[PDB]
């Protein structure tokens, strides 16, 4: 608090308040007894749960047939009207466009439209699979996805 | 007619203004204006001014008669209280209010 200990009574003799302080947390000034600050919110989670998840989640998309392996979905040039048609013609939307492969025009163009974001095989996580229902990967991507995970 | 009337920010003791609504509540006009000016209180000549203005709208704002106007509803609501202090004494002060009203006359049809 930016306050001080100055005491708003001179002990009993008067009965305005039993509080000795204006640095109380119950004051108009306030203070709050368990005030927020820097706190940690990061959990461990084992590497075998991590893999473990992306294996059950993998083998859940398969059972819900929504995992798509299509190749050469890389884009020749920045212009997202080419990355529109790539999904569209294959009647896809809500995609990840997840590959370990390097095409930078593909990372750049994926940033526009908020129903797709930049995803990589090496960058893989749960939440991104789960939300963005169609799941798009090259023959090379899957081969690498095996070693990375299991 | 139906016309309202307020004098807002009347400085005047409000329990006393309530007394003088009653005095002429529902007893026509043109003698209810006379009573106030020939009775007690300067609450009389404060609600009086509100009264003759209510009437004056019941004239000019439609009307043309004081012959068929009865002072149907007359009240007064508690108005914004004027905060002040009183040095009461011996190192004690108190918020002391200059209590107030919204004098409301509402003449209508007789």
């Amino acid at each position: 608090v930016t306050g001080s200990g100055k005491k708003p009574w001179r002990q009993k003799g008067t009965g305005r308040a039993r509080s000795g302080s204006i640095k109380s947390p119950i004051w108009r000034s306030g203070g709050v007894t368990f005030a927020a600050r820097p706190q940690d919110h990061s959990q461990k989670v084992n590497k075998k749960m991590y893999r473990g998840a992306l294996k059950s989640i993998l083998s859940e998309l398969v059972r819900q047939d929504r995992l798509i392996v299509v190749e050469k979905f890389s884009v020749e040039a920045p212009k997202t009207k080419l990355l529109a048609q790539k999904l569209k013609d294959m009647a896809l939307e809500d995609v990840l466009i997840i590959t370990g492969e390097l095409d930078e025009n593909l990372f750049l163009a994926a940033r526009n439209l908020h129903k797709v974001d930049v995803r990589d095989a090496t960058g893989i996580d749960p939440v991104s699979l789960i939300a963005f229902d169609k799941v798009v990967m090259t023959a090379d991507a899957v081969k690498q996805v095996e070693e990375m995970l299991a | 007619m139906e016309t309202i009337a307020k004098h807002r920010h009347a400085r005047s003791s409000a329990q006393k203004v309530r007394l003088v609504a009653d005095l002429i509540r529902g007893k026509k006009v043109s003698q209810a204006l006379d009573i106030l000016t020939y009775t007690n209180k300067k609450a009389a000549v404060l609600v009086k001014k509100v009264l003759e203005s209510a009437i004056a709208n019941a004239e000019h704002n439609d009307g043309a008669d004081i012959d068929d106007l009865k002072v149907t509803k007359i009240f007064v609501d508690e108005g914004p209280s004027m905060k002040r202090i009183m040095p009461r004494a011996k190192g004690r002060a108190d918020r002391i209010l200059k209590r107030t009203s919204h004098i409301t006359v509402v003449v209508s049809d007789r």
Binding site: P8, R10, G13, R16 | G91, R95
Partner: peptide
Amino acid sequence: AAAAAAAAAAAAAAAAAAAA
């Protein structure tokens, strides 16, 4: 429309204990 109002904290005691 100015305002000034303090708080008071001074004693009203003057009377003395019964039966010590």
